[PDB]
Structures are given as C-alpha cells and as structure tokens.
Amino acid sequence: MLDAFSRAVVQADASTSVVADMGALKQFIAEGNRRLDAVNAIASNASCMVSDAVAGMICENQGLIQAGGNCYPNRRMAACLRDAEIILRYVTYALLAGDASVLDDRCLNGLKETYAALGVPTTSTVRAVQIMKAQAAAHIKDTPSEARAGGKLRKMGSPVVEDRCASLVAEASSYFDRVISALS
Template sequence: MLDAFSRAVISADAKTAYIGADELASLKSYISNQNRRLDAVNFIASNASCIVSDAVAGMICENTGLTQAGGNCYTNRRMAACLRDGEIILRYVTYALLAGDASVLDDRCLNGLKETYSALGVPTTSAARAVAIMKAAAVAFVNNTVSQRKMAVTEGDCSFLATEVAGYFDGVIQVLANHLKRNR
C-alpha cells in the first residue's frame, strides 16, 4: 500500500500541488481492491483443508485405482503426501494472490514440483486433476458463491481476483501437463 500512496504524494509534489480529488479517488479504489484481495485470501486460507481434501477425494473418485494396491494413494503415508502436496500448492497460490504476483509460486513451488514428481513417479494427470478441482473451489470461494460457506466480504466485483487465482492454478496445471508430455 505504501507504493500507491508514495506515488500519489510524489506525483502531487512534482506538480507542487496538494493531492487532488482524482488521486484520492484512485487511492480509495486501490484500498477497496486490496480489501477484496485480503478477503479472497482469507476465504481460501480459512477453507484450505476442505478445498484440498475435497480435491483429493474428487481425484480418487475419478480414478479409484489410486487407492488400490500399488496405487499412488494406497497407503496412509502416500495419501498423507498427496494431501500435503495439495496444501503446499494451495498455500503458494494464496501467497501469489496476496502479492498479486506469481513469482513466489514459480520460484518456491513450481520449479521443484516437476523434479519432485518425476523422482517419486507421481502420476501428473491425477495431480493436475486435483489442482483443477482446487481451482474450481478457490474461484467459487473468491466469488463467494459457495452455498454452504458464505462469508462477509468487502462489497464489489471480485471477478478480476477470480480470474487472477484461476490463472495461478492454470500455471500449476501447465507445469504438470508439460511434465506429462516430456515423459511420454
């Protein structure tokens, strides 16, 4: 927030004038958007366990072989690893949403994801499907359209945030899809 305020002050100072109505309206809009961003991050983070467990359950329902002997979710340890990975991905997506910048997601999560999944033999189609389910849930939370879990949020249009968070999930899915193409 300091950057937006600093820019307004520097701009007014360069004009040797007070901060005008246009600058104040711009700052008011900035604050409103940031409050919506914080609400979106809070909504996702508050429901992270449900988002991840529902995504993993959905992935398993679509591919029951994952929980059978030899499947990647067969033992408790493997299931726990799957849930942990989902939580890590969701956490970094929320960090990116909070910052409004995907670099933290790219640097801290996605760069190592390809190598880790390759070394462990994780089926990336299943992982990508779980991420797609998390994406749908997160977008619904950002838009506050989850019927059972409404929250009091800052009024206004959050479609730009829903599009942004969907883009972060799409980036994760793209990394997994690229991994899949290279290993065929």
C-alpha cells in the first residue's frame, strides 16, 4: 500500500525526480494531530456506527428481512453486519494513511463482482455505506445528534476550530464515495 507521502514519492519517480513540492506534505504534518483525532473518532464509535447503519438500511427497506430478503435468515444478517464493519475498517485505514490504495487494493478490488455472484443487493449495500459516511462526518466534526444517538451519544472532546476539520471530513467522505463508486 501507499500513504500520502509514498504517493508523492511514486509520482516524482515517474520522471525520476526528487520531491521538491514540500508544501502539501508540510500541511499534512501540521494537521497530523487532527487526522489522528478523526481516526480515533471513527474507530471509537465503529460498533455503534456499523449496527446503526445496517439497522438503518433495514428500516428503510423491510424487503431485506422478509422471505427471500438478503438479510434473512440470521447468518445473512450476521454476514452483512460483518461486511459493514470490514468496509468501515478499510476506510479508516485509508484515512489514517491519507491514501486510498489500501482500500482499493485489499477491499474494493473485485468487490462488485463478488456481490454480483452472491446476489448481494447493490442498492442496499450503498445505502449502508451512505449512512456510515454521514456518521463518520458527524463524529469527525464532533457534532453527533442526540436525535440519532440517544443514550449512546459520544463526545470526543477534541480542540475545536471553526471549520471543525472540514478538509478531513471531505477526505473521509471521498473514501466512502470510492466504496459507493465501486459497488455501482
């Protein structure tokens, strides 16, 4: 896999040149602590996220839990909860590395085809991914609602800035989007 830095290294090597543009990387560094918070925010809330999202996917489409539904019977429900967790896990890897390659390589590569063979519904998988995308954004900004969380609400307590890390939220979202783009 690559990280944000070895990515720049690969791009430079393509013309056998030294790395001279050391501004984006310096920037990456200066927001290093925020990145760590962003990752910590998702990982710490990963179980609540996964179950909320798959449950959210189901509550919007009861088809999934009826006869012939792809979350019926128990083992399929378990399998789906498992997959949701796997995708979230790789996305968080991508965010920690600040590069999508680990996600493309070890998770998304051949995923659509696998789901096609199994008859795992594309629409529904994408939805679950969309719900986690919205979850991750909220936790990174540290603005989750009590409305969506209830008694399981969690506050990260990171040093607040005005844009509440808008850049990292965009990055994280762009990884979930790679998932969605892959599954469709």
